[PDB]
Design a binder for this molecule. Structure first.
Ligand code: HEM
Length: 399
């Protein structure tokens, strides 16, 4: 059984194994870092099955849970938030914070999203690039999602810059373990103060709603509110930053599509759909154990065995997506959903918000900067480590 996670074939490419497995061994066992085994599912239909089957559990205290790193086992001991709950606990908690993320609520947030993007672009323009290229990640891909989720959560404007830097430190590959941990605990400490403040004087933010609607009635306690707020901050931010950077890189790699997008910013929704299919920035979240035996394709997954369903692989499944390794923003979409945001009950709470952030970025960035260029050869872009989720660390640009 091969060691999993697999390493990307190269900076921007999925691991090579998936294509071979889809063709020859679509449900197979892999070996995790601790020597334990897990079933790896690679076809779109089977990923959807795993995502929705009521015979499978996200509860990490079940033995056989496929923890992928030593730190993952550590984290499994803490009180779970809804990301790791099954029904009925899952929606009991997830519903406490869904209202901000509904399609309609996101539609009404569009002018706020646009303003945030515009303001960061204007700053970038005034900082300029007269002495040399600037880092698109630091100056734009990082602050856009960070500023939005922090503001939604209830952080005041003045504190965004420092807290954006510290949340980045948490996940920067360059951070030492100490630095990352300190930044983590620091964000938690910050959030705990905000919870105290909003319990005394609520404001129009997600933390206040937790406080008034859940803490004060005794449905959850203050610590729970902190953890839920924290989940919402850290679950998707690194993914968003990576999707923005990858989109810029992908457009540079496919100049005619950049040309099309500049000529018609109304193509941004379809560009984002293709981007979220092609670059599966969160590929390791659809994990389960079997509560009882379940058949998947030609395999029996027994009770207490772990399963990993690769939405990355699903998104490249030739049976669903014609010419799947072709980036094509004019793609003719099939009836089956791309799985960038997962599937089933646990499907990304923020899918609508993420897509709105990305659409706003890709309908504005090249209007503001029609001559934006990556300022290193595309071959030399600094991607995330090949054994981690796809992403970009920094991206020098000129404009
Ligand atoms: C482009 C950016 C993003 C991508 C690609 C993405 C992708 C994902 C994927 C693959 C999952 C797993 C869903 C499943 O279990 O089937 C997920 C879950 C989740 N995401 Fe995102 N995400 C993104 C942005 C966000 C943002 C902006 C937030 C927060 C605001 C967020 C919050 C969450 C949470 C809380 C969950 C857990 C949902 C549950 O288990 O009920 N995500 N996301």
């Amino acid at each position: 059984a091969p060691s999993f996670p697999f390493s990307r074939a190269s900076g921007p490419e999925p691991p090579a194994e998936f294509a071979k497995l889809r063709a020859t061994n679509p449900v197979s066992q892999v070996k995790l870092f601790d020597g334990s085994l897990a079933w790896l599912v690679t076809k779109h239909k089977d990923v959807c099955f795993v995502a929705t089957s009521e015979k499978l559990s996200k509860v990490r205290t079940r033995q056989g849970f496929p923890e992928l790193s030593a730190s993952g086992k550590q984290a499994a001991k803490a009180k779970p938030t809804f990301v790791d709950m099954d029904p009925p606990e899952h929606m009991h908690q997830r519903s406490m914070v869904e209202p901000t993320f509904t399609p309609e609520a996101v539609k009404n947030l569009q002018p706020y999203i646009q303003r945030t993007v515009d303001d960061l672009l204007e700053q970038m323009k005034q900082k300029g690039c007269a002495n040399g290229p600037v880092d698109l990640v630091k100056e734009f891909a990082l602050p856009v999602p960070s500023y939005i989720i922090y503001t939604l959560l209830g952080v005041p404007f003045n504190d965004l810059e420092y807290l954006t830097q510290q949340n980045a430190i948490r996940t920067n590959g360059s951070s030492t373990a100490r630095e990352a941990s300190a930044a983590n605990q620091e964000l938690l400490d910050y959030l705990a103060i905000l919870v105290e403040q909003r319990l005394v004087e609520p404001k129009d933010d997600i933390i206040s709603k937790l406080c008034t609607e859940q803490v004060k009635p005794g449905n959850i306690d203050k610590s729970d509110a902190v953890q839920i707020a924290f989940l919402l901050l850290v679950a998707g931010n690194a993914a968003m930053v990576n999707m923005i950077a990858l989109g810029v890189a992908t457009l540079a790699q496919h100049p005619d599509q950049l040309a099309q997008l500049k000529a018609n910013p109304s193509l941004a929704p379809q560009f984002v759909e293709e981007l979220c299919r092609y670059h599966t920035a969160s590929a390791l979240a659809i994990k389960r154990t079997a509560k009882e035996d379940v058949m998947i394709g030609d395999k029996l997954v027994r009770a207490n065995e772990g399963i990993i369903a690769s939405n990355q692989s699903a998104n490249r499944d030739e049976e669903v997506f014609e010419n799947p390794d072709e980036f094509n923003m004019n793609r003719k979409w099939p009836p089956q959903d791309p799985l960038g945001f997962g599937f089933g009950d646990h499907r990304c709470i923020a899918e609508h918000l993420a897509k709105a952030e990305l659409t706003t970025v890709f309908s504005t960035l090249y209007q503001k900067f029609p001559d934006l260029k990556v300022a290193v050869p595309l071959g030399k872009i600094n991607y995330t480590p090949l054994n981690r989720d796809v992403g970009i660390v920094d991206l020098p640009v000129i404009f």
